[PDB]
């Protein structure tokens, strides 16, 4: 179905960029985000 079109050449950058943003938001907004803090 659509999962073939999801990885098309044109949608490559957009879908990759969205996923990276999605991970970063969760990473910062979760207890894992504390890993960046050093003291």
């Amino acid at each position: 179905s659509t999962y073939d079109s999801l990885t098309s050449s044109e949608n490559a950058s957009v879908v990759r960029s969205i996923a990276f943003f999605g991970a970063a938001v969760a990473f910062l907004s979760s207890s894992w985000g504390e890993m960046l803090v050093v003291q």
């Binding site: 044109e10 949608n11 950058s13 957009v14 990759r16 960029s17 969205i18 990276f20 943003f21 970063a24 938001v25 910062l28 907004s29 985000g33 504390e34 960046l36 803090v37 050093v38 003291q39």
Partner: protein, 325 residues
């Protein structure tokens, strides 16, 4: 009856959301490196002659791929006036002149003369108690028999103490030979206790999103994402699509400041500012590595700041000197 509205407004906890231009300052101005990165050597010698009025002179030298080899800059500011000017090597003058009408409203102005393209840019900014409005005009002209130039109207409203909505309307015509061009961009901003998120639906369909979280008093991190679409790059209809997202963090130390950032295109960047003890010098190391091509851009800077000001002599006035930057 305008008094009735105000007495109703004060019942809420609303507060100024800032300007549309600053709707993503935390991510795109404080943490990410996009504005501070450079290449080649650079040096900024500065001297401060006073603080009330604020008077300051500075020379900038640069080299390498940073081809612009010199720029003299002077800055004069006071409670009602702020005037500044850069005069680069080729004689091109870049200026700035903001005049304050009152506590909240100022009338910025920015000219560029000489060089590639002459430009003028006026804007009347009003930082209301619970909203920000700003009408801007770029290279305005009526001499062509009618209104001409780019006009921008910003507006940002606080709807609930955390959330702020606003839009930026545009209007432009490059000569009376053609019809005008208009656009609208919608903006939103949400600020919780420790994190701030904002979005921007721009004219071309491009969407920009950002997220900033303050992990601790010394550590911040934020991520921004840009999506865009262009018309039929395939030459056979359709629309091409692209996007990029960057993640970065800023660390504030006692005598240093460190920022790191990585794009979605494999480009990794780093910037370190160190202040040398009691002296006013502040080195700046900026490195940028692209992992796809394995090429690297490198830059070092040294900023000096002499001064002839007895700080406590004038700092008492500077603390309350509301220069209209």
């Amino acid at each position: 009856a305008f008094n009735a509205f105000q007495e109703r407004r004060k019942q809420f906890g609303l507060s100024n959301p800032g300007t549309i231009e600053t709707i993503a300052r935390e991510v795109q101005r404080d943490t990410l490196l996009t504005n501070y990165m450079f290449s080649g050597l650079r040096a900024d010698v500065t001297k401060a002659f006073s603080l009330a009025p604020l008077f300051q002179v500075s020379h900038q030298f640069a080299m390498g791929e940073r081809l612009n080899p010199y720029a003299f800059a002077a800055l004069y500011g006071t409670n009602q006036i702020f005037a500044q000017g850069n005069l680069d090597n080729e004689g091109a003058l870049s200026t700035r002149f903001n005049y304050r009408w009152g506590d909240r409203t100022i009338t910025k102005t920015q000219f560029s003369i000489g060089g590639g393209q002459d430009m003028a840019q006026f804007e009347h900014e009003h930082l209301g108690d619970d909203f920000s409005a700003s009408l801007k005009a770029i290279n305005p002209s009526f001499l062509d028999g009618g209104l001409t130039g780019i006009f921008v109207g910003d507006y940002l409203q606080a709807v609930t103490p955390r959330l702020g909505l606003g839009l930026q309307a545009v209007w432009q015509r490059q000569g009376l030979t053609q019809g005008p061009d208009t656009a609208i961009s919608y903006f939103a901003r949400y600020k919780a206790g420790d994190w701030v998120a904002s979005a921007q639906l721009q004219a071309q369909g491009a969407l920009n999103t950002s997220f900033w979280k303050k992990l601790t008093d010394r550590v911040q991190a934020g991520v921004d994402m840009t999506l865009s679409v262009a018309p039929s790059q395939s030459m056979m209809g359709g629309l091409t699509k692209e996007g990029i997202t960057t993640f970065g963090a800023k660390y504030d130390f006692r005598m240093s400041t460190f920022r790191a950032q990585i794009d979605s295109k494999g480009k990794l960047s780093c910037l370190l500012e160190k202040r040398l003890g009691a002296a006013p010098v502040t080195l700046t190391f900026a490195a940028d590595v692209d992992h796809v091509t394995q090429q690297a851009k490198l830059g070092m800077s040294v900023s000096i700041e002499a001064s002839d000001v007895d700080l406590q002599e004038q700092q008492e006035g500077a603390q309350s000197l509301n220069i209209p930057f």
